[PDB]
Design a binder for these strands. Structure first.
Lengths: 162, 168
DNA sequence: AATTCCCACTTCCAG
DNA sequence: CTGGAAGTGGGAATT
């Protein structure tokens, strides 16, 4: 089902992260930076996940400080999401130890979950936030959804052996 | 069931519009612009005003289809820039298309004027042209019109019934 | 979502 | 067996 309450949103994020997390440590630090996925790496993909997660936190930073949010990101438009994926790859290009990469994804995920707990259910799925899209729906678009999508491309990859 | 003739199509439109319009008129203008409703697309919140905008967008789109046909120009289905799996994305366009209409009475007039043009248009087609042969893919012209006039009218009545149970 | 896409989940021969 | 085409069936589509 599509998440439609605060409780549902949290549980989707936890579950999709769990499974994706398990598939991610299943990769060795050596394979993770090779190009196996117009082809990228697990490292590239996890940076894409951190870029989006960081960005969602950034939106709420901006919002908290009374500042107008620039969606999706400054210098980008919603039809350019692959170009925003290029920026994310580079943003974390110099994190060369897989172990730190996964640790940074995991703590980002934790912050997002903490951010959601901070809002009421009306704040997440009752009111409109970005045009008609609710705050919770927006958060799911760029967290729980790409977790699933990412874990997909992963289990396909593990089917390369041997 | 589904209208099968020019006569049925025109009556189902006038009925479902008359019904829907009764519920729409029994909603305060102040309330009608409040965001309250889960929208056509999951994870959105919309007003009763957006609900009407959705109908106006679909009806004018239907008139636009025919305007294209009347000039001998190729129709783009469902609309320029949207594939058929992007109807959620189109509903949003329809909200924005009419959001500068801030007076509820003007907006229901726009829906009323739109519905009159739609039946006036059905009036100029024979039954054969409406239900006699396919017009787009396998559907008949009448089906395509009913599916975006009569049906969404009734659908909007449904949501208004459910909301009428609470009145704050 | 009329359709469209994208998964997960099969068959079922080729190997 | 055994990937792995290739075809199905259900659910979501979004920003």
């Amino acid at each position: 089902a599509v998440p439609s309450s605060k409780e549902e949103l949290i549980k989707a994020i936890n579950s999709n992260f769990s499974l994706l997390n398990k598939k991610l440590e299943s990769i060795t630090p050596q394979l993770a930076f090779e190009p196996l996925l117009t082809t990228i790496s697990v490292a590239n993909l996890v940076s894409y996940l951190i870029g989006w997660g960081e960005l969602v936190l950034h939106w709420h930073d901006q919002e908290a400080k009374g500042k107008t949010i620039i969606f999706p990101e400054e210098g980008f438009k919603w039809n350019e999401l692959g170009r925003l994926a290029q920026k994310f790859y580079r943003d974390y290009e110099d994190i060369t130890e897989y172990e730190v990469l996964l640790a940074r994804l995991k703590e980002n995920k934790q912050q997002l979950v903490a951010l959601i707990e901070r809002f009421s259910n009306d704040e997440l799925y009752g009111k409109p936030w970005y045009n008609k899209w609710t705050r919770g729906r927006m958060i799911q678009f760029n967290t729980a959804s790409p977790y699933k999508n990412a874990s997909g491309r992963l289990n396909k990859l593990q089917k390369c052996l041997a």
